[PDB]
Design a protein around this ligand. Structure first.
Ligand SMILES: Nc1ncnc2c1ncn2[C@@H]1O[C@H](COP(=O)(O)OP(=O)(O)O)[C@@H](O)[C@H]1O
Ligand SMILES: [Ca+2]
Ligand SMILES: [Ca+2]
Ligand SMILES: [Mg+2]
Lengths: 743, 146
């Protein structure tokens, strides 16, 4: 009995031996723990690579491609600082949590230029290069989809893609600098320190580099999605608000500090080490000057940021403004160009408002102002690299993936809806790539299929009957209620395969939720229990008419211009659906590449591979679905060079003198391998499941018998060598005659 | 291409001598290298013009079907045999009507084929039907269509 991979609660998988087989489960003996046994379902036990020390650049070079061999392979590579590995064209990127030397240098960028995947070690640069080459050669726009949990490295790898593209195929002009300075500038306003990531993206983005007919850079475009509005006013312990606040408070000059009435972050309600706020303010100002922001615009942005800070310091009491909040109202009115009394009225009027309702009005005005400023910043960045026309683009998508929370609310619902649509796109594209390969390599008929999740997408977004539309209807009711909304969803989708009631859950924590207080969605990656409290409130982006009129009639042009664009109700869900639908329209018109970012542990430490956590990420990123798809045909793929180097030692020297292709041709003829199970493709040998392992066993068998098999095909081999050079001689003469013909 | 399945199969093996890294594609670089190796001397203008006919793709690379198209031209009955005779003369360096083991070695190693002097003698012996220890035109042709 050969050792196998069996489940392990913290490692994901462990090595063991099947000590007993049953109809449903296998009895596993963990390695070197004689007498210890555990049960595992037959579908959770996997074959292992004989060589536990080997590592492959492409997981398709494994004898068994499964979730356990993949996990082990990326683990071996990770311990050697090889954070990049392929699964055919998919790139897996494991966050190292330290600066690996050489691999991001300008000299390494050069070494990747014009090179096909597989001709260089796996890298983010190779994916970026493939998008350029495919765009130029196929005359088709490209997309690079970068997924993963918070802290997995999506923002870093998006940045590596843009530095690679600009240094390699950019103009050499300032537009190159503007493309690379765009996102660090947006990071000041849209990024924040969280428990999971010190530089967490609190918004999704699609970054496009636009090109003309000659594959030359003409501009760029940035689309932003779901800025986290809650963070503006309230943040959990160990968390901060957006970087800009701390950066402005830390680095502003004596002049700016006086004009904006700024002090340390400790003096602001909306505000809460190894984070260089001072130095980051310096880099932000450099980015601002590089993209073309004048000192006036810089100050206008800062005034609004300071205005929001002072608004947060306005406290109330049973209502009226607290005596200590008089200086805060004055500082807020001045910076926002409003009259002190008009603002005072608005923060406590309808007609009178209680302390809590007053806080909500203050917080709603703060959230709306900050959000409008973030929209302005994104649009201002877009104005720094505009274009009238373009032929194609290379777009990088960086958005939060499907993830775990103890409490899933409206924000997780939107993110999980997004990932349900992106996972469908990923499935379609991996299936298309598999079909192309069976045609190109002559692997015959495909007959491979995934489970579509259109029903899950429809449950969420279908017109009239979808959750998003049922939510909007609730917002429009005279007395909106989260319970009435949840009941409407349960009534309308009672028979739905993708919907469940909390009461039915195996988990006591979910069963505690009343039917009208939550629902379970069977997402592609697993069932999620949503608590629907605050759904109706979170679905409204609209600011109350009193507050809106106030800020619209502002003395400052810049503040008026933030609202120049603009029952008070704006659907967050349906705004996102529209944005997501335009994003998919763009993605569907492109050739797509996928990067799967993996967070190795929850402690931001280097060299700490948490097997179960990583295995869970590979499950939630759609990778196991991808491996099932590949298992349906020829999951083992080894080039003639790879097999020649692996197996030449087991053969006579006469065969070792042949080129890899002829060495492989001779081996297949000598072994008499069947063309059903083994396919001799264009540049590689394709093996059906278990066939590469069979072949490896035959190669490692009796040396004298192998030599006899080779002797038996001697005549055929001599004739093959002769014909190769004779037909090559005819090629050269035919090619010489074609040159003569054309003259 | 509109060639016999067997001719395509033989030319597919010949194409692997151009595609050393294999890879699946070749450029003017590999065309010229191999052509020089077999007594031909095209210019970079000639190679670039020839590749233009079979590359609508524009990336400066060609695959096996594109290579087949590049070799194709309007031909006469006589033209085909003249080519095989010319191919044999590539091997028969001194033009004495026989390919010697020494002549075969020159061709083999010019093409980067690795093999001992014993193995060259072995190839000669296998192609040598009449047993005179060398390969004539009839024997070269019989081997070419084996
Ligand atoms: N390849 C990498 N090399 C070095 N540090 C990295 C790399 N990828 C991620 N990091 C580190 O991990 C942090 C979190 O990564 P980030 O790109 O912000 O994750 P995400 O956008 O997925 O939330 C970074 O701020 C950086 O410190
Ligand atoms: Ca001679
Ligand atoms: Ca003879
Ligand atoms: Mg991020």
């Amino acid at each position: 009995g050969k050792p196998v991979w069996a489940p392990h609660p913290t490692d994901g998988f462990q090595v063991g031996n099947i000590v007993d087989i049953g109809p449903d489960s296998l009895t596993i003996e963990p390695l070197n723990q004689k007498g210890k046994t555990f049960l595992a379902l037959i579908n959770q036990v996997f074959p292992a690579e004989e060589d536990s020390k080997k590592d492959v650049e492409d997981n398709c070079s494994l004898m068994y491609l499964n979730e356990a061999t993949l996990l082990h392979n990326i683990k071996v590579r990770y311990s050697k600082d090889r954070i990049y590995t392929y699964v055919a064209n998919i790139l897996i990127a494991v966050n190292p949590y330290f600066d690996i030397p050489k691999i991001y240098s300008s000299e390494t960028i050069k070494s990747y230029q014009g090179k096909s995947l597989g001709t260089m070690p796996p890298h983010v640069f190779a994916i970026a290069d493939k998008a350029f080459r495919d765009m130029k050669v196929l005359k088709l726009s490209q997309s690079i989809i970068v997924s993963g949990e918070s802290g997995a490295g999506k923002t870093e790898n998006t940045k590596f893609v843009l530095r690679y593209l600009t240094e390699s195929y950019g103009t050499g002009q300032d537009i190159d600098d503007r493309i690379v300075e765009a996102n660090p500038l947006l990071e000041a306003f849209g990024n924040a320190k969280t428990v999971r990531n010190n530089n967490s993206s609190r918004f999704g983005k699609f970054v496009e580099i636009h090109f003309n007919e000659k594959s030359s850079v003409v501009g760029g475009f940035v689309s932003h999605y779901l800025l986290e509005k809650s963070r503006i006013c309230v943040q959990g312990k160990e968390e901060r608000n957006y970087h800009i606040f701390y950066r402005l408070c830390a680095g502003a000059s004596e002049d700016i500090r006086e004009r904006l009435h700024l002090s340390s972050p400790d003096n602001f309600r909306y505000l809460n080490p190894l984070l260089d706020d001072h130095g980051d303010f310096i880099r932000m100002c450099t980015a601002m000057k590089k993209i073309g922001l004048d000192d006036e615009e810089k100050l206008d942005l800062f005034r609004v940021v300071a205005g929001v800070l002072h608004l947060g310091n306005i406290d109330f009491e049973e209502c009226n403004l607290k005596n200590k909040s008089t200086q805060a109202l004055e500082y807020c009115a001045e910076l926002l160009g409003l009259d002190q009394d008009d603002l005072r009225v608005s923060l406590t009027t309808m007609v009178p408002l209680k302390v809590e309702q007053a806080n909500n009005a203050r917080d709603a005005l703060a959230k709306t102002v900050y959000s409008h400023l973030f929209d302005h910043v994104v649009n201002r960045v877009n104005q720094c690299f505009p274009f009238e026309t373009s032929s194609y683009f290379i777009g990088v998508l960086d958005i939060a993936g499907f993830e775990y929370f103890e409490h899933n609310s409206f924000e997780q619902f939107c993110i999980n809806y997004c990932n349900e649509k992106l996972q469908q796109f990923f499935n379609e594209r991996i299936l298309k790539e598999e079909q192309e390969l069976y045609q190109k390599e002559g692997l015959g008929v495909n007959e491979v299929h995934y489970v579509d999740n259109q029903d899950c997408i429809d449950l969420i977004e279908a017109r009239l009957v979808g959750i998003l539309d049922i939510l909007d209807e609730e917002n429009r009711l005279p007395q909106p209620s989260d319970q009435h909304f949840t009941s409407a969803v349960h009534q309308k989708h009672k028979d739905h395969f993708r919907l469940s009631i909390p009461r039915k859950s195996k988990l006591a924590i979910h069963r505690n939720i009343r039917d009208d207080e939550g629902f379970i969605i069977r997402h592609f990656a697993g069932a999620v229990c949503y608590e629907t409290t605050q759904f109706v409130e979170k679905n409204n982006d609209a600011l109350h008419m009193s507050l809106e009129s106030l800020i619209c009639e502002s003395r400052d042009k810049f503040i008026r211009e933030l609202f120049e664009s603009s029952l008070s109700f704006i659907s967050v869900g349906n705004k996102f659906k529209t944005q997501l639908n335009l994003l998919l329209d763009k993605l569907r018109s492109t050739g797509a590449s996928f990067i799967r970012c993996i967070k190795p542990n929850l402690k931001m430490t280097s060299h700490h591979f948490e097997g179960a956590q990583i295995l869970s990420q590979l499950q939630c990123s759609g990778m196991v679905s991808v491996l099932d798809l590949m298992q349906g045909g020829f999951p083992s793929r080894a080039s003639f060079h790879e097999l020649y180097n692996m197996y030449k030692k087991y053969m006579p020297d006469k065969l070792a003198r042949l080129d890899p292709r002829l060495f492989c041709k001779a081996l297949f003829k000598a072994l008499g391998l069947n063309e059903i199970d083994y396919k001799f493709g264009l540049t590689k040998v394709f093996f059906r499941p278990g066939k590469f392992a069979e072949f490896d066993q035959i190669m490692k068998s009796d040396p004298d018998h192998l030599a006899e098999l080779v002797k038996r095909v001697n005549h055929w081999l001599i004739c093959s060598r002769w014909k190769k050079v004779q037909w090559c001689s005819l090629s050269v003469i035919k090619l010489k005659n074609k040159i003569k013909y054309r003259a | 291409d509109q060639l016999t399945e067997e001719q395509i199969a033989e030319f597919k093996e010949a194409f692997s001598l151009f595609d050393k890294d294999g890879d699946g594609t070749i450029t003017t670089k590999e065309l010229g290298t191999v052509m020089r190796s077999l007594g031909q001397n095209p210019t970079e203008a000639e190679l670039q013009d020839m590749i233009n006919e079979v590359d609508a793709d524009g990336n400066g690379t060609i695959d096996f079907p594109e290579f087949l198209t590049m070799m194709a031209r309007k031909m006469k009955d006589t033209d085909s045999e003249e080519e095989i005779r010319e191919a044999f003369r590539v091997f028969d360096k001194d033009g004495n009507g026989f390919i010697s083991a020494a002549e075969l070695r020159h061709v083999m190693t010019n093409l980067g084929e690795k093999l001992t002097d014993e193995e060259v003698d072995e190839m000669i012996r296998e192609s040598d039907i009449d047993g005179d220890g060398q390969v004539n035109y009839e024997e070269f042709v019989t081997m070419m269509t084996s």
